[PDB]
Amino acid sequence: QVQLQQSGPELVKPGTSVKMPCKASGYIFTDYVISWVKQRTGQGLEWIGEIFPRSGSTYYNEKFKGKATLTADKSSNTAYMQLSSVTSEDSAVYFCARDYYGTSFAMDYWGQGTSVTVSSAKTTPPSVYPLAPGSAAQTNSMVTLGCLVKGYFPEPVTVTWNSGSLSSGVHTFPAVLQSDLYTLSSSVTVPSSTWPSETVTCNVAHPASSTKVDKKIVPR
Amino acid sequence: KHVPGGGSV
Amino acid sequence: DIVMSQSPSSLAVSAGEKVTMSCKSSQSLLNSRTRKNYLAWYQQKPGQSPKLLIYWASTRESGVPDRFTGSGSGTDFTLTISSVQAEDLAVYYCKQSFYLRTFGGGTKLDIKRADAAPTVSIFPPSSEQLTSGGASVVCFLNNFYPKDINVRWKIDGSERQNGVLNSWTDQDSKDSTYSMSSTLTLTKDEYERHNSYTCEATHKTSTSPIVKSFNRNE
């Protein structure tokens, strides 16, 4: 069970350096190269460079020479990428991937990505608000409830319902940015029989501010 | 050696 | 320093149909000694990191359904998905490893299905929010197809066109539907000077809009 572990979302100020880890397990770290790949929001995958941890040798995409610096710690089976003097052009998700050098030459396992937001705006945690139907009932067999997650910076937040146990019927919407703050909402659709007789709670996580909130949906 | 890709295998 | 092109950039088919997408490199990716084209295909779903499908042009990676078939040689390559499934919704990238690595621009795969009308729900502001001086009214338009939909807010019968933010989910991998959120944000004071709040959805499925309403007093 090969697995590549990357750190959580980060907010960095323009002009500074950010150094992110990619922890490998399940295979011989020194027998495969680690490639790194950039993805700007809504955009394609862009190869940054690679490192061979055995030897420390690196190659880069010309565009990232002296912007990215790739390194590898053999004692911890961990690869690092450093972006230097960051600008808003570096706000992106950065994946690491194991790269089968010598044979397939493909990237067969990927990390989840580290989401980097380069900005001067201040980390702000969200206010979570319950969205519960008004005094009416109609097509009563199903009911929709929601959570509004307002005024946070930066991306992203993780919404779940009853700690992931309410899985089906859920729509969590893309955030939209207004004047340095993001807002989204999530909807959950349950049998009219299950609510309010049983509890429904949205769980919001905002990694960048170390925030986790739980909001119970109660009638009215 | 660690070559830059597949074209040198 | 090999440039890669993918075409077409976008694509729609119904479940069960065959699809093919092309990938071109500015140089041959074929190495004479190995006899392999160093070209791979990757699938990227929403919220997900890319997954390797195919390497050496035409070899499937383990775990990948056989309906995904890679083909071609030199500078011109093809990924084919026979019998597309609703789960195949994704962007597909090609990538060269003959010399360094270069991803193609990607080809987005969208699924066609049968028209379906939104389930609309409308929500008045929460007590909490009105406690801090905001009032956001929320309206969810769920599980509809196609993606094109118009939403109209009315306050006391009058169409309202600002303070409105809209957001669409990615298409759903189970049912091939889209959902949309629409959020009308006013100040508390502004919210409290009107009674009836309404969101109206007009969609291809009916010439008659779907209306949901509530009253502050209700």
Side-chain angles (χ1 to χ4, degrees), chain A residues 2-137 141-220, chain B residues 2-8, chain C residues 1-31 34 36-217:
Chain A
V2 42
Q3 192 206 301
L4 292 175
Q5 189 56 48
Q6 303 190 251
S7 64
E10 285 192 58
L11 168 58
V12 298
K13 295 177 174 75
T16 69
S17 283
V18 52
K19 192 186 166 148
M20 63 194 83
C22 165
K23 173 71 186 279
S25 61
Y27 77 95
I28 314 287
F29 186 57
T30 57
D31 286 3
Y32 301 73
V33 322
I34 297 288
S35 284
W36 290 88
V37 180
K38 174 185 190 186
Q39 195 175 44
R40 280 192 238 224
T41 306
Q43 301 300 299
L45 301 173
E46 186 179 17
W47 186 68
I48 293 174
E50 72 183 31
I51 181 169
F52 190 28
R54 187 183 283 153
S55 69
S57 294
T58 61
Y59 301 89
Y60 297 89
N61 170 347
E62 208 54 18
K63 277 186 32 143
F64 294 90
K65 297 257 280 159
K67 159 59 71 175
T69 302
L70 309 184
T71 52
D73 180 56
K74 290 203 300 290
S75 57
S76 69
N77 282 7
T78 301
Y80 299 97
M81 178 164 71
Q82 191 176 18
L83 298 162
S84 57
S85 193
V86 299
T87 74
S88 90
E89 311 298 322
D90 302 316
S91 298
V93 171
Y94 290 91
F95 300 98
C96 61
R98 186 184 84 177
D99 186 336
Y100 215 147
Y101 159 82
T103 97
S104 79
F105 281 104
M107 303 179 196
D108 49 4
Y109 296 85
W110 294 65
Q112 74 282 1
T114 301
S115 186
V116 180
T117 302
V118 185
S119 179
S120 294
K122 262 69 188 74
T123 287
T124 323
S127 321
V128 189
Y129 304 125
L131 303 179
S135 301
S141 73
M142 293 300 267
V143 65
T144 291
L145 309 165
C147 265
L148 180 60
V149 183
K150 201 174 193 294
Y152 69 85
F153 190 80
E155 284 266 63
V157 297
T158 296
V159 185
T160 65
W161 294 91
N162 286 333
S163 313
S165 90
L166 263 172
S167 188
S168 284
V170 178
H171 305 102
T172 291
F173 293 93
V176 353
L177 210 171
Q178 202 165 52
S179 51
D180 306 316
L181 294 178
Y182 286 100
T183 294
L184 65 73
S185 54
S186 181
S187 86
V188 67
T189 291
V190 296
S192 204
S193 84
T194 52
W195 185 85
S197 72
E198 294 168 304
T199 301
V200 174
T201 298
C202 80
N203 328 105
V204 185
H206 182 234
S209 69
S210 311
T211 290
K212 263 154 277 108
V213 166
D214 294 336
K215 189 64 58 155
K216 187 183 293 202
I217 314 305
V218 314
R220 297 180 183 75
Chain B
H2 197 275
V3 316
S8 32
Chain C
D1 293 309
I2 304 187
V3 183
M4 302 297 290
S5 304
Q6 286 186 247
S7 65
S9 68
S10 207
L11 211 33
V13 295
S14 309
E17 297 178 348
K18 195 181 92 145
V19 90
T20 75
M21 63 197 83
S22 163
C23 165
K24 311 194 173 224
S25 64
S26 68
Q27 301 176 28
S28 176
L29 308 180
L30 172 61
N31 150 94
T34 58
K36 314 251 162 229
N37 288 273
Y38 297 96
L39 186 278
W41 285 99
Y42 296 83
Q43 177 195 67
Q44 196 185 27
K45 306 191 182 202
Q48 285 195 13
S49 46
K51 153 172 201 194
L52 169 69
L53 295 188
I54 287 153
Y55 63 88
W56 294 329
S58 65
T59 295
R60 255 183 300 286
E61 167 75 332
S62 302
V64 174
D66 65 15
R67 69 175 182 272
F68 298 93
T69 306
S71 54
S73 185
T75 77
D76 295 336
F77 301 91
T78 300
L79 174 70
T80 298
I81 313 175
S82 47
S83 177
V84 174
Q85 326 254 281
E87 300 87 342
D88 299 343
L89 191 128
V91 178
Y92 292 84
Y93 293 98
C94 64
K95 172 212 66 131
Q96 151 276 325
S97 22
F98 179 86
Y99 172 66
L100 310 178
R101 319 265 180 278
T102 307
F103 288 83
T107 294
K108 194 187 180 188
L109 182 63
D110 290 313
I111 287 124
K112 291 175 131 69
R113 68 155 271 160
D115 289 62
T119 303
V120 184
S121 335
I122 182 158
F123 296 89
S126 71
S127 284
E128 287 95 324
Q129 194 189 19
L130 298 166
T131 306
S132 72
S136 287
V137 191
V138 179
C139 168
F140 294 128
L141 292 77
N142 287 340
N143 300 273
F144 63 96
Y145 184 90
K147 190 177 180 136
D148 307 278
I149 195 165
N150 185 71
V151 179
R152 220 146 70 270
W153 283 87
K154 290 160 173 254
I155 299 171
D156 287 334
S158 267
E159 193 173 328
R160 185 70 143 68
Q161 291 138 350
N162 249 293
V164 180
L165 278 64
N166 297 331
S167 171
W168 281 252
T169 60
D170 305 289
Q171 179 164 217
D172 196 291
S173 62
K174 298 286 138 206
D175 66 3
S176 316
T177 63
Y178 292 85
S179 295
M180 180 191 159
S181 172
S182 191
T183 305
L184 172 51
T185 300
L186 290 58
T187 65
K188 178 168 97 161
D189 296 6
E190 175 51 26
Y191 170 68
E192 289 182 348
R193 289 194 271 102
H194 313 275
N195 187 44
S196 92
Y197 289 89
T198 301
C199 71
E200 299 197 2
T202 299
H203 188 256
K204 193 153 79 72
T205 47
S206 150
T207 52
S208 213
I210 301 179
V211 183
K212 302 297 260 215
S213 287
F214 71 84
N215 304 296
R216 196 157 43 81
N217 309 337

